[PDB]
Amino acid sequence: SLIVSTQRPSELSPTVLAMCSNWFSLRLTNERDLQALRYAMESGNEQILKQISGLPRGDAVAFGSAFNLPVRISINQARPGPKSSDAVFSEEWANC
């Protein structure tokens, strides 16, 4: 079983994306990164694709075989979380 996480779905083989049963999607603002998602899934739904262009932080749209109908979910926070971030320039530049 595979879990694929990427930010550029267009730079992938179409077969790999077309051979999945479930899809999770967060905000995605690019015209060529939405055609791939449109091609991967079957036809019959277009009003759910307009929301992806303006989803806020922490929201996602899920549709597949484990969901009866597409749902807009607000995901919980993990505790403890992954590593926070990289270095911050202000702290090191003000350590006189």
Ligand X SMILES: Nc1ncnc2c1ncn2[C@@H]1O[C@H](COP(=O)(O)OP(=O)(O)O)[C@@H](O)[C@H]1O
Residues lying near another protein in the complex (CB under 8 A): 1-7, 9, 17, 19-29, 37, 51, 54, 56-60, 65-69, 71-78, 81-82, 86, 88-90, 93-96
By CB under 6 A, tell whether 1 contacts ligand X: no
Q: Which amino acid is at 51?
A: Q
Instruction: Quote the distance between the C-alpha of residue 22 and its chain's center.
Output: 12
Out of another protein, ligand X, none, which partner does residue 41 contact, by CB within 5 to 8 A per kind? none
Nearest to 31 by CA among 52, 56, 62, 59: 52
Phi, psi values for residue 59, rounded to 5°: -115, 150
Q: Decide which of ligand X, another protein, none touches 15; Cβ closer than 5 to 8 Å per partner kind.
A: none
Is position 77 an interface residue for ligand X (rule: CB under 6 A)? yes
Work out the number of other CB atoms within 10 angstroms of the CB of residue 12: 13
Residue ranges binding ligand X (CB under 6 A) = 58, 75, 77
